[PDB]
Write a protein that binds this ligand. Structure first.
Ligand SMILES: O[C@@H]1[C@@H](O)[C@H](O[C@@H]2CO[C@@H](O[C@@H]3CO[C@@H](O[C@@H]4CO[C@@H](O)[C@H](O)[C@H]4O)[C@H](O)[C@H]3O)[C@H](O)[C@H]2O)OC[C@H]1O
Ligand SMILES: O[C@@H]1[C@@H](O)[C@H](O[C@@H]2CO[C@@H](O[C@@H]3CO[C@@H](O[C@@H]4CO[C@@H](O)[C@H](O)[C@H]4O)[C@H](O)[C@H]3O)[C@H](O)[C@H]2O)OC[C@H]1O
Ligand SMILES: O[C@@H]1[C@@H](O)[C@H](O[C@@H]2CO[C@@H](O[C@@H]3CO[C@@H](O)[C@H](O)[C@H]3O)[C@H](O)[C@H]2O)OC[C@H]1O
Lengths: 739, 772, 390
């Protein structure tokens, strides 16, 4: 048999052999894609007639054979098998396709579990739980013959105007990077032939658009770019061996990311050693022409993207077919096509597709992971405020009010395929329900009814927030940016009208972004933040309200007092986070309403006995930080212990405090444990005036606490010795354990 | 005589001779400063006792001998002469001091005219008028023996939260640069021995702090930095030969500007050829330690600042005395001190101070420039909205309402002497441990014409109700205002800021406004007055854009009056009654709301919108009023666009002509604006960006031709490799009455090979008028 | 009077005023040159007929009015006075010429002392003696109305194959730099109105050609370049305030020095703060075309050299006349011409030429400096070996 067909040969040999056999047209075909829906008839069955046109010379990827066809799992699996058989048996070289789906919150297609949104995942501060989640997602995807998931989002969000905030892991490069590595590891596993390719997106800076506006310029200078925005992707590449990256739609400082070789090649491939495929953001090649206006035609767009280092044009071939013409006309070298094709073929071999591209349809029934979803929902909800009203007693009469109290659709996030009162009923609570108002618009005609049921109750539970998705009726999600951060519609007014009854008020926010709570916070008795929880949402909320679950989520993003305060974030430099010299704005504190890492409990945790050893370490040494934490209250609960590091008198300015470690710790009432952080000096490296990564001698401040503001214990150690340039591989994360 | 004393020798010879004679201590002394107030006794007279300690080895500068002493001009001149005589006659080498003052809106001291704020200056779009202004300021300053004015501000402002917005020339690097060059040219003149050193500030990026917060990081990437923030300073250095620069307090991306040699030396001196002195922002050296936490002590702060390229520590020696110790301990080379001292001595020779450091006290009486101030105020006020109510008829009974109708203090900006000095009053009042001044302030304040006075002089029948204060939540004055409105024909509601440095101020340095709502309950006052159903003219006397989304549709006309200083009242009333036809144009976009920030006219194709619904969920992405906006009591008709030639090579020139006719019934000035757009460059470019303008006077029914000469140098931008280029392709020409009100469009092409623009290149379009 | 004519005005004011009055043609003329021998008749006297063609719009420099004419000193002084009177009185703006001569081993013309070669100068290890020498050369040159001497050579020589070894101060960047500073200081003095502009050459690397062959590539890596070859020029610029630099004919690693903005502008002007004029090596602009083959015609050669930072084309205008055409055709900006013209006019003001461009012919008799020459010769000879015979 030909070498490329022989599984006893090393992949490099098979790749070289195959490439040597391919025509230019066949090469270019491997750099494009076709939609699943383009390959089916009106009953969702594979159409050989359509495949003969679209797959004649092979194809790089099939886009969303499940997500774009609305097929149930077994039918999607059958479609994918039929596509693969056509490629294997009815093309000249028989190269199989790679299949991709969205999977951020689970496989985005019929029959898959709708897990809580990414910002909820982050709020758990539980990396192992997220790895468990994506290990499940991996098996769901493989059942239908899907090889690649377009997740996770490693965009670092400090601008909650942006509609895609919900898809991020929040403001902290450390927490984003750590959750990202766990996410990737679960999807891919050790041998990708048994796993699913992860796709970190949107490389890079995409969460920092001008004015929080989708696709607008992300004008970030170099040190900030490296330390905040690139860092999570760097960790995914080097620690998690991520096998795909997708680019940002935005320009950075005049250069669209899809046309930026310095970004997609020089940083990603040359500096960091990425060996997988870069897939375009959907239509990102064409919009080099249409939107950014730097390419005069589809040929030029193709050339810019290929030179930049985009290997596969998604979601359908549009500009990359003109790569054939560009070679034939002597405008680009076929060697550059070969480089891209090599990357794509290698990954196809690594996935095992040339040995077996088929799945067993009888096994393609996707299993529910409602259990994992509920664990995330229960650990993600954040208790922002509680004057003692919560937990409630079951014998209290509840007035359940608001648009998000009754509305299952509004529990869903923007990449859940299908984009509470029931939970109260199941728990056996006596309540009356009033919608109060819609999520959007100005209609106040439901206020009187809500007020009247409040007046007759013991406690009003007001459930407000977003509708997430991509259409105009949505208040958050991709393309739905909110300038002024007010709760949508007249929901704020509803809360305040209910509060005016004098009844106790529990405010439940079911939202995708931070909202300004400045006008309600001091008028309500407790506040729960419930990031869009998907199919597990209702149960977790009621579990928390009644104390069956002790809330344990912590904010992964700061809650601004107002939009005019943006940005607020915990790791400001000494000059950040204040106005000099009066501290505050004329009209507003410079402090966020709720800080990063904030989250209360129905119990109290007491921290003691900080140990830092040794007190002096050299610039590639390690310190071990220990604290004791005791649950001194009356309820079992989890605490997320947080490690912040500060530095002064470096050669550049540094954060006053910045997250460098954390551990979720379970404590029974009156239980005490020791939490241990092992901190390698590599983890503290920062860029100096010359853009070198260094550790400089001096003092580092250690701050351990329950939030970025609720610091319990402080101390310090010193780095002693000559400045160190940190070269080559280095540690990214602290290790945490319990003793 | 020693060579340095001999005026027949070239300055370089005199400098080298002097430097060769100086001790290390004497050298370090030239890099520092003393406050004016440290050199006077209780009667405001020079104190030899204090001078013996502070000036014994000479000094670089005296900080604000007028501005910090509350001396009248002849007394300040006497002080300065006595300081110079002490230096000339009672120090070993007899080196005279340079004196600096604030002068942004005029010499900031007693007796100086209070001109309108810088943002008002920009709103005139009249560079020559600003040059006339600073030529007058030059003469005022020289009368008191001042050599350097700490102006202008070339910070480009796109974030109106920032309290220093009023000190800027707005959002456009083009307009800021062009106004800055005129400003500098007027202060300095041709021969600096007869002029005043200008000080461009705050180098660079200082108007782009995180969240609009004073001193917070200004994290700007390189092409934006060069094209937006550096550009006005580049023009000031290369076209206007500016002789001083002051640094930004902020860090850029981890590096404090006061410690950044890449900025204060490599860009400013090496790349651009700046030959003057860099003066520290006040206390900027020390706060490398105290604020940024990158210097461990005062010695290290001094070293970082000197290495970066700061020549003089202001406002008083604090860290730079330790440069002596650093040399003596072999930590720094004396050669690096010599480089700084050389710059300072050269400028002192160039100012003529070694030939004559004295002024004639009998001539030190500063003249009023109310005339120039009034021309600026009259050309600066912007008509943002007018449904036809303006101009008003003089027979209409007016209800004059609001805090800014009745308080002269609130006409003043943050670097006008009687506003700025309030901070000192606070600090004196805060002394709880171990007079004539508060009286001289009040009496000088009383001299300033009021808005009330202006209405009275114009002969209008009106009643006045304060309505509310600038700050706080007290609505107990609303009822009175509402009642006088109900009894009137028209309510003129005058609201806005109190500008300054203290907590009771709403704008100015250190007073940043997050949410851009009119201060206090002033918005509510406007809306309550409107609810009477009477016609409402809203007059904003402010230092920044405010959100007007909640009032714009509820009022009949809106006038923006950037803090106008002493000419304010007359100009406002002149405009309201049509004695002056408003002609100001916005130099900065007015956001709909704070959450929309930033909004600016020169967005890239992906800027200024949210894709793919265009708007935010809750808000338009368009500003409420765009850059260049400003209405008139007449109408201007644009015709006959000519663009020649249609194809030009990469260092060629195109000539753009338009005819503009005043087709209305009142004489008026129009500011004709030229915008250029470009696509299919190798980098993204603004869809439209200002590249030229001309204020043109037109009588009723008069037509003139406006001509723009546009060299391709002016269009240069930075490519992917950070080279300044002109690339072949098509440029769109858009000429109109604002950045949105484009009247005529066309295009020309650049033909030939891509050009790297090297060395000196043109910065500005030339604009003139011809007979139509 | 016009500001540029007024000696009470600062030079910067005079420069800006003059530049503002000049046509493009007059500007370009200040960036070129004419040979002395092109301006004389068969009897060695100034020719008004020849001047009317060659000087009609003014000129940057006259090349070697003594060195190229075989005139005795008083006759060369007369020639130079007649050239200057023509420029001052019979051109529109009356800008005087700068005159240059060779002077490495003394004024290179009849009547000047022949001092020992530069390598002999270095062999004295006596910087003050060399400063005494060039102080004398200064007075010789000023007597004939010469303003600039094309010396010293600061090329550091480690390859004795090269025929220009004798013109260098040898192999040591330290000794070359120290001798160079003294050389420059003697020629220029404190106030250049009373001195002669020195011209450090050949910037830079020119003594390190492939195989020791004249004009061949000088392929020197960056640290060596900075520490060995640039260092003496750096010292001349920063310590000695040298007012002219002349470029190397060679390429460095693919880039001819006459076309290298990174060298003649970014290092020399931006990094080091040089404020004088860069004068081309003779014919160096044209040979960007003829020899290096990187310019397709004289226009392109002119553009490359001007962009690189050459202010004056020597020894005669050849390519730089096309700078007029390049501006008129919109290929280069007139601002770039203005930058060069500014440098040239500033130096002409600093030399006092607008106050007095003439010399007294009765004083133009150059004195012998055999005494100084003998001290150098006596201190320069090296005893390499002596078994006792001497
Ligand atoms: O109320 C009291 C507070 O004021 C005081 O805090 C200090 C207030 O003054 C602050 O220093 C300021 C810093 O900014 C300087 O402005 C520059 C001056 O020169 C201008 O040309 C330039 O444009 C400006 O940027 C200003 O001169 C100086 O006074 C100081 O940092 C504060 O700490 O604390 C005590 C309270 O009672
Ligand atoms: O025998 C005849 C050959 O000479 C002739 O070839 C030309 C000879 O002259 C060459 O031009 C030289 C190039 O070097 C110049 O020297 C510089 C002058 O200024 C000094 O300050 C600087 O130090 C020197 O480097 C010299 O002036 C000039 O004459 C030319 O390139 C040759 O092609 O061909 C005809 C034969 O018959
Ligand atoms: O994370 C990836 C997303 O960034 C990506 O989203 C695409 C965004 O563009 C959408 O196209 C718009 C649809 O509406 C029209 O009116 C607009 O003109 C279009 O630009 C497209 O539908 C999205 O797929 O999708 C892939 C994700 O992994």
């Amino acid at each position: 048999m030909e070498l490329y067909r022989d599984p006893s040969q090393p992949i490099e040999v098979r790749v070289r052999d195959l490439l040597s056999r391919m025509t230019l047209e066949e090469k270019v075909a491997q750099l494009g894609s076709v939609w699943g829906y383009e390959l089916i008839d009106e009953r969702g069955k594979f159409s050989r007639e359509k495949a003969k046109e679209l797959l004649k010379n092979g194809i790089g990827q099939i886009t969303r054979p499940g997500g774009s066809t609305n097929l149930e799992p077994q039918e999607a699996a059958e479609l994918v098998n039929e596509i693969q058989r056509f490629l294997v048996e009815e093309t000249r070289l028989g190269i199989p396709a790679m299949i991709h789906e969205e999977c951020l919150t689970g496989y985005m297609g019929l029959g898959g579990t709708n897990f809580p949104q990414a910002i909820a995942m982050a709020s758990t501060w539980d990396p192992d739980l997220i790895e468990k989640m994506t290990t499940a997602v991996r098996e769901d995807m493989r059942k239908i013959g899907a090889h690649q998931g377009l997740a996770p989002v490693l965009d670092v969000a400090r601008d909650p105007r942006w509609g895609r905030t919900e898809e991020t892991f929040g403001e902290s490069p450390y927490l984003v990077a750590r959750m990202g590595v766990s996410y990737v590891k679960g999807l891919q596993g050790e041998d990708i032939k048994k796993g699913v390719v992860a796709t970190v997106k949107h490389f890079a800076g995409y969460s920092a658009s001008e004015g929080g506006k989708n696709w607008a310029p992300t004008n970030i200078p170099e040190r900030e770019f490296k330390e905040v925005f690139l860092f999570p992707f760097e960790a995914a590449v080097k620690e998690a061996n991520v096998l795909s990256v997708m680019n940002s739609y935005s320009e950075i400082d005049g250069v669209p990311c899809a046309a930026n070789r310095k970004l997609l090649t020089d940083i990603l491939r040359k500096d960091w050693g990425f060996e997988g495929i870069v897939v375009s953001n959907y239509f990102a090649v064409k919009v080099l022409e249409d939107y950014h206006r730097i390419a005069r035609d589809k040929s030029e767009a193709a050339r810019l993207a290929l030179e930049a280092g985009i290997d596969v044009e998604l979601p359908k071939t549009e500009c990359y077919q003109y790569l054939k013409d560009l070679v034939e006309k002597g405008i680009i070298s076929e060697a550059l096509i070969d480089e891209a094709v090599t990357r794509v073929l290698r990954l196809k071999f690594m996935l095992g597709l040339f040995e077996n591209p088929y799945v067993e349809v009888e096994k393609a029934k996707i299993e529910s992971h409602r259990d994992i979803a509920l664990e995330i929902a229960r650990k993600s909800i954040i208790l922002l405020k509680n004057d003692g009203i919560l937990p409630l007693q079951k014998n209290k009469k509840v007035a359940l009010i608001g648009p998000n109290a009754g509305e299952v659709r509004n529990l869903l996030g923007d990449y859940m395929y299908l984009a509470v009162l029931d939970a109260f009923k199941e728990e056996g609570i006596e309540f009356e329900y009033a919608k109060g108002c819609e999520v959007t618009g100005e209609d106040r005609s439901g206020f009187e009814e809500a007020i009247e049921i409040a007046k007759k109750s013991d406690v009003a539970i007001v459930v407000v927030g977003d509708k997430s998705g991509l259409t105009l009726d949505c208040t958050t999600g991709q393309s739905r940016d909110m300038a002024n951060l007010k709760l949508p519609g007249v929901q704020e007014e509803l809360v305040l009208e209910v509060a005016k009854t004098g009844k106790p008020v529990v405010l439940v926010l079911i939202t995708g972004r931070p909202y300004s709570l400045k006008n309600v916070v001091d008028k309500v008795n407790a506040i729960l933040q419930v990031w869009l929880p998907g199919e597990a949402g209702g149960r977790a909320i009621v579990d928390i309200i009644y104390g069956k679950v002790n809330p344990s989520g912590k904010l992964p993003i700061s809650f601004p007092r107002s939009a005019g305060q943006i940005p607020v974030f915990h790791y400001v430099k000494p000059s950040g986070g204040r106005s000099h010299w009066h501290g505050d704005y004329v009209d507003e504190s410079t402090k966020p309403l709720f800080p990063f890492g904030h989250g209360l409990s129905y119990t109290k945790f007491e921290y003691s006995n900080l140990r830092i050893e040794p007190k002096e370490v050299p610039p590639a040494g390690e310190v071990v930080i220990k604290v004791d934490v005791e649950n001194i209250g009356d309820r079992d609960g989890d605490e997320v212990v947080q490690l912040y590091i500060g530095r002064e008198f470096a050669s550049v300015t540094r954060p006053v405090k910045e997250l460098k470690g954390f551990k979720r710790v379970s404590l029974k009432a009156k239980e005490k444990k020791t939490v241990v952080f092992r901190l390698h000096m590599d983890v503290l490296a920062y860029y100096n005036r010359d853009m070198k990564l260094v550790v400089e001698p001096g003092e580092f401040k250690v701050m351990v606490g329950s939030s970025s503001e609720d610091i319990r214990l402080t101390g310090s150690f010193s780095v002693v010795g000559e400045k160190r340039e940190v070269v080559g591989m280095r540690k990214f994360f602290t290790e945490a354990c319990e003793e």
